[PDB]
Design a protein around this ligand. Structure first.
Ligand SMILES: CCCCCCCCCCCCCCCC(=O)O
Length: 133
């Protein structure tokens, strides 16, 4: 099961290739500029076997509740109606969003008490590091 070291509140402290990740999904040019400046706070809670990942920003807010391996509907920060699944692999929390015959993965790993986020999309690789607060 998901390591409870994921639980807590994480604050973004480093972003790489996110600008290109955003652009690579079709994110509106207005929603783009505001995402390159956002430093969201991420809160991972649990309530039995349901995992909730909240994304709190000044700009926007998002939130997803799910069970591992079970497909759910997600509406993304940039308004994408996706059909996502979250799986566990070697301790990494891999989320995959599918829509319009497209697909992207968000692997959330832990590295030295800090959470790393690998976002893939058509050869684009974003990397965001998160510090527990
Ligand atoms: C997460 C900032 C929201 C504002 C920017 C909107 C366009 C981004 C769309 C996809 C969400 C980004 C996923 C990376 C977040 C993470 O690593 O926790």
């Amino acid at each position: 099961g998901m390591s409870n070291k994921f639980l807590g509140t994480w604050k973004l402290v480093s972003s790489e290739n996110f600008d290109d990740y955003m652009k690579a999904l079709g994110v509106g040019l207005a929603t783009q500029k505001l995402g390159n400046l956002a430093k969201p706070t991420v809160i991972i809670s649990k309530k039995g076997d349901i995992i909730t990942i909240r994304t709190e920003s000044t700009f926007k807010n998002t939130e997803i509740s799910f069970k591992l391996g079970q497909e759910f509907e997600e509406t993304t920060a940039d308004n994408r109606k996706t059909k996502s699944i979250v799986t566990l692999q070697r301790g990494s929390l891999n989320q995959v969003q599918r829509w319009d015959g497209k697909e992207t993965t968000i692997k959330r790993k832990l590295v030295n008490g800090k959470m790393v986020a690998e976002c893939k999309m058509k050869g684009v690789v974003c990397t965001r590091i998160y510090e527990k607060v």
